[PDB]
Amino acid sequence: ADRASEFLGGLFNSLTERGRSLSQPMSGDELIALSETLLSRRGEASGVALAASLLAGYEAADEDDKLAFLDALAEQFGPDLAELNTAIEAFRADASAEATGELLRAAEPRRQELIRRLNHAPGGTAALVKMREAVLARIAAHPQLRHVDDDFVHLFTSWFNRGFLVLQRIDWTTPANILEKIIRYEQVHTIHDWDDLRARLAPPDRRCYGFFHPRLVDEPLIFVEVALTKDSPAAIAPLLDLEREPIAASDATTAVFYSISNTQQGLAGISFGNFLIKQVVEEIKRELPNVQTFVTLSPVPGFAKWLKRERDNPDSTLLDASARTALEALDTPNWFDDADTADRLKPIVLQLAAAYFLQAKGPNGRPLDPVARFHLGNGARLDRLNFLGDRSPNGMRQSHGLMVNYLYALGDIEANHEALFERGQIAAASAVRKLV
Amino acid sequence: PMSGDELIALSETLLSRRGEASGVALAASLLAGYEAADEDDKLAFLDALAEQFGPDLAELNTAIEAFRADASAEATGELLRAAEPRRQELIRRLNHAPGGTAALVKMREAVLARIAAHPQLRHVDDDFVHLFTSWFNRGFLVLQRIDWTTPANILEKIIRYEQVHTIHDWDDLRARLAPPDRRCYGFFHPRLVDEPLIFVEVALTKDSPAAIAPLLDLEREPIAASDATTAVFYSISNTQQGLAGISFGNFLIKQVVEEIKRELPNVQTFVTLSPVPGFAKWLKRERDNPDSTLLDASARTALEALDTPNWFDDADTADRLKPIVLQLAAAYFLQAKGPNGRPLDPVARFHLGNGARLDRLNFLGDRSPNGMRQSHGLMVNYLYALGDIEANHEALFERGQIAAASAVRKLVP
Amino acid sequence: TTADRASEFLGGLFNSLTERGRSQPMSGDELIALSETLLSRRGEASGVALAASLLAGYEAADEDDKLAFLDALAEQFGPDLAELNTAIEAFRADASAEATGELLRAAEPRRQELIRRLNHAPGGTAALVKMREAVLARIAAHPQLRHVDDDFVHLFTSWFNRGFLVLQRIDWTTPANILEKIIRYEQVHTIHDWDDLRARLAPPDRRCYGFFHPRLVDEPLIFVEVALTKDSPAAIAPLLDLEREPIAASDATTAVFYSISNTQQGLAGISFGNFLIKQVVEEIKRELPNVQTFVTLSPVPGFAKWLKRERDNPDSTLLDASARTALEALDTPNWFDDADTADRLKPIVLQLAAAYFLQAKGPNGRPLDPVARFHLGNGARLDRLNFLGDRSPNGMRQSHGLMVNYLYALGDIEANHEALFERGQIAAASAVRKLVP
Amino acid sequence: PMSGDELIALSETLLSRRGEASGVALAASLLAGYEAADEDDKLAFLDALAEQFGPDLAELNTAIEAFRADASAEATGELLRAAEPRRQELIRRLNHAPGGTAALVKMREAVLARIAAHPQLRHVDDDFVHLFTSWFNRGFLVLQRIDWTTPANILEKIIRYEQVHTIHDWDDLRARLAPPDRRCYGFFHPRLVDEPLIFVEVALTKDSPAAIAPLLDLEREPIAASDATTAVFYSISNTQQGLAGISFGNFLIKQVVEEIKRELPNVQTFVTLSPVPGFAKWLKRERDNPDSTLLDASARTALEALDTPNWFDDADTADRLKPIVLQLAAAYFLQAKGPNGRPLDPVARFHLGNGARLDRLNFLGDRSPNGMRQSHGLMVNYLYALGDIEANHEALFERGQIAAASAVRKL
Ligand SMILES: [Mg+2]
Ligand SMILES: [Mg+2]
């Protein structure tokens, strides 16, 4: 039945209210010592006790002691090499069930149990996420921790099940402890104090939502900023216009997604499903059924640095001197001003930009642009390419000002998605694809 | 409907799917088809799960050759991934179908049911346990008072899963949660909606019972909550068969008493009136004594009076059986151990596990036909004290040390 | 966040008031004496204690003692006649604001303050409803209690504000304690234990709703039974036939109200708004958008009584020699069991029914038939007359088997309601309006 | 916009309306009209309310004749009906409009405020109070904890409505809600969504303070919940101007302490550190007495010190104002009364009415500029006990017996 919606609501409410209810720096060595103790503990009370302790000791430790520990999760808490070999020989001797099971057992690094146990401490999950954040930041100077992050991903993928994710409008009636977080995760608009915030949430032509999961109480995991309007924008400058006149909800037909952000560093790479946006769309449709179309005014981070690599190679598959000439006009502080040099680049940029999307592919079989991977993964369609839609000194170096417009269509959202994942079809508008 | 072959095929498809919407659709269809399948087609699919769906050997082999060549971290990590039965990914995916968790839990009931006739299915069961252990986290287990204001669909489930003192109909039911001197609680998990994973039936009283009949019988009169001083756990039921062997934590009862205490601060003594679903099965196996420091010559003597249609009403041939049986029960608890070195009896494992103390042995505390089949009407009282729960649990788990009252550690031969 | 926010909020507060909401025999004289203490009391703690005491006493009192007390409310607890006259003379002397203020104070009987205070006892409102049920049951044999009932209505009206009325679907996920009460309030269907209720609610083509108000926690005031179908019926027998084959709710296109009941005798005559069915329709629609037509299959209690009066009237407005002659058929064992007698009657009856519905008014000016006053007031349209829709011995004595369908169109509910209340215009279909003389 | 006359016209159309749907439509349209209209039109409508909307004389007289011609119960009940001012039906109708109760509460504020300048409005007030008493039934009042996880639009209101120790910004607010040594409760009623009618600010401690400075101070060390034995009610506010004079019960505090203890059973002593707004105008009117036993020559002199601007910052002239004031405060309390046998202090009538007993007169407990303004920096304590609350309440209401402490009586 559908009663499942109420049951989970009631349940997640007991969980959150419960959460809102509930020390001296340690060295890298002690932390390791403590881990071993926790891994051999049998009692459940002493277990959470050692766990909470370890987590407090780590949060308190000096940046150096922290790294000593993370490194140890690589060297001292991987699988037992002896056992694993024994187990390998057995399988090699007879590919039996007994042997194929002990192999699965012996190949599991001890870290997994350690993380599974640390997670029993009150606040454990939140601390664990902050820990994966530290290892993610340590991969560079210590590639070894890439395997330590692998195990966090495994476990996290299991905890943050997409079935328990939930969408909530983040308006002025939202709990203060949560909004206080929004002040921090706010990407676009500026917000220093609660006044800036209320003001930010005030306008009736502005909206924003958040996805919450019971594993992290009162934590908006994904933040979705929307703008209500009648026209489908091609420039960001206007939507963020502080002195412009805002309209009314019934006075809109096109909801435009100007910002979508993952708020927790430690959750990078953890999928929360691919029909997120679809949900944010229905919420808007249920509230304001007038809204006929749903488009996004997303950026294109990676295009500029793609135009670099693609130009630096004088043996481009489709980029001659005729182009490379006027092309490098971008190599000037201010070029977007000269209305002349502007209309010159438009055709050439939009032409290479179209390639960057439908043509360019990253490592694995998938679009190079990260924002494309997302919105496209979410069944949207690469509808329009707004040249110079963001002339901010930020976007100018990010994508040379180039901004695009993905369009979500309730009808064929799932359709595009299957296309993209099963085959490779990059749902794009005809007007953009004819720039090969 | 669908045949084992067709299910096996659709499984394969689901496993190689890459689109979410299409994946969930395939998962919802396979589950739907499995349910419609036949006892033969079903055993076919559960079996194809124990053979075709184990770890992929081709990929396991490469991973091993790679590790042998270079035992690098990447190689070790690769070996783990490839050592995973395909079953696990299959199970994880069906779980995305709506009602999958429930469906999945019913499927595990099905393998746990066939395991005896098909010991290979046991390898499939291990993987459900691995996932289930991760899905049913104790952190989301929620205690919820269950009374007459509780939805009917849920109450209906309690009459069906009540496993200690059978609840005949809705009147017996109302009888157990409507009186102000009666209390019921249940633990719920977001993984299974409206499904009380574990529910406890307590009786608010002034004394520590020794027989259920008095608690059950629809005759006696209640008593205001503020009047009682003692809470008595007279029934504990683990509802989902497919959830057998998944620990929900050892401090479950500690929560039910913390609840009862904040509500009725007038209740300061907590005990249980529990069964012993493994005593008749023990004593009988012990009656074919090849050589035991327990039973002797003048032993089986009174142990015959147990084999009657009702030896529990004639003080004659029974009063002679009380001190022999209790002497032996004291042996069944403090000495008899299960294959894992834990206390032989399931219910003593639960309560001792929750920090309770074996406080008293009640000879013939339950006369019902069920009580007779389990331990010859034998029942015991475990005691719970918030101040000792943690210690007893820790002491039991860390050192295998059982917590029993002196008045019982003595009755051991 | 104001239409949905106020609902979030109200739902919440109500949930609190729900869990929060989840005695010796006295003589009429003692109860009356007590009412006097309570009335003069000043402390809140003792007020409640006394009131709680009086209610318990009343409950346990003898039927004679209850009755004496109710009568006491009429003669002893009315307005103080002395000061009332004093105030009348003050105002006749000079109609000042202070004069009409005191007059208003002077006219209010002590019954009101007594009821208001008894309402503070826990379980007070429920007890007062039960008590009002008693005075309602005694107005015949005791016409003086009518002025006691008038005071109850003034307070109940203010307490049971339509704004807090909430609609809830009633099914197997509904709390047992509420379902238990439902097993007693069930109208059409027959229900014994829980197997009946569970059975009666199981079918996917059946759906009943309830209206709840925070004043009477866990209590369904108005119970609405509906049937999911693919056509607007003309006879109940089929709908109620257990040996019928249900249909998936998604397959249905029609929603048919076939039972609407007020569950609290003591609430009789208290309005909960005219847009009740509106809410039930908007609800079904959002759950099953696959339903376009909203129609009822109502009874016409009081048609038989009316027809009798029309016949016994030697000067009947529209009963010629023929009609009178044919009608005599209605006065036989099972005339309905003769296709010929039936088809002969159908034209004359249906035509009389039309004048009944469209012309027969009440002692005020409202449509005489109580079920029509309801559905018409709920903005419905009288859509069709179903000759011989219910041949159950009951329906036969009620309206000679005559049933009807009222048509609810979620686009003219307000229009029709306004017409009936503002202009007195009945919303009937031509098929029936062009059937009147 | 809309003129007072067009409003009075609408009201008349609403009173005779029979249709429900159009009934609430006109009601919404009147509320909105009144709401956004010049002050002058407003006073028009409100004065019309006292004038053109009292009872209908015709009907009232007809009803009078009948009663004089036949004092029957049916004639009586009919008189009562006709004595009701049309205003009531007007209000009752406007209240069906979406958001009417809130609009109506605001309108009462409009009249209440204009009374002093226009006493004929007091009559309008009278029917507002009649209806509000009925509507704001105490049984639907709900106690709710108000911490940092509370909806913003509500916390905002808590800020805006503080009336004991002003809150300046959200951080300052966060301060009274987040710190574990702190707590806050509000009372909500279904008639006004998200509107905290009454809200209390308690400072969990382990003693019984006599000054606010050490409570509201940002620089302070927190204390765990269980690390407290007491509870200190330092601020209590009644939020709705328009709900002035409507009782929400007399056991509001008994509910809060019952909640604090069920959570922190480590608290076994609940006391307040309340102000005394009725001390300013009392002593300021006191020294204008033709005669006053509580004010002699030897007193009215050592009391002259308070006249200076800043005398609270000198250990010197201050210890003479300690015994003379306490004896007048202890008098003002146990003695002084208002137009009724009830205590003159609006805060004492609240706490005593709530079952508390005057336990101490913490001299100069408030240094705030507003504090001196009223109680001259003086503060008092009130002791609540889950044993005497009901007993004290009764004594005060049944017999006017002011439960106080010996330490305070003699003075
Ligand atoms: Mg795993
Ligand atoms: Mg009145």
Numbering used by the authors:
A (entry chain C): 10 to 31, 37 to 450
B (entry chain D): 39 to 451
C (entry chain A): 8 to 29, 37 to 451
D (entry chain B): 39 to 449
Publication passage describing the model:
Unexpectedly, the MCD catalytic domain is structurally homologous to those of the GCN5-related N-acetyltransferase superfamily, especially the curacin A polyketide synthase catalytic module, with a conserved His-Ser/Thr dyad important for catalysis.
We solved the structure of RpMCD by the selenomethionyl single-wavelength anomalous diffraction method and the structures of AvMCD and CmMCD by molecular replacement. RpMCD and AvMCD are also tetramers in solution, based on multiangle static light scattering studies (data not shown). Like HsMCD, the RpMCD and AvMCD tetramers are also dimer of dimers. However, the relative orientations of the dimers are substantially different. For RpMCD, residues 55–58 in the other monomer of the dimer, in the loop linking the first two helices of the N-terminal domain, approach within ∼10 Å of the expected position of the adenosine group in the active site. Moreover, the loop and the following helix α4 are positioned differently in RpMCD and CmMCD, suggesting that the binding mode of CoA to these MCDs may be somewhat different unless there is a conformational change upon CoA binding in these two enzymes. The 3′ phosphate group on the ribose of CoA is recognized by Arg387 in CurA (equivalent to Asn421 in HsMCD). The equivalent residues, His423 and Ser329 in HsMCD and His389 and Ser312 in RpMCD, are strictly conserved among the MCDs. However, this Arg residue is not conserved in RpMCD (Asp404), and in fact, an Asp residue is conserved at this position among the MCDs.
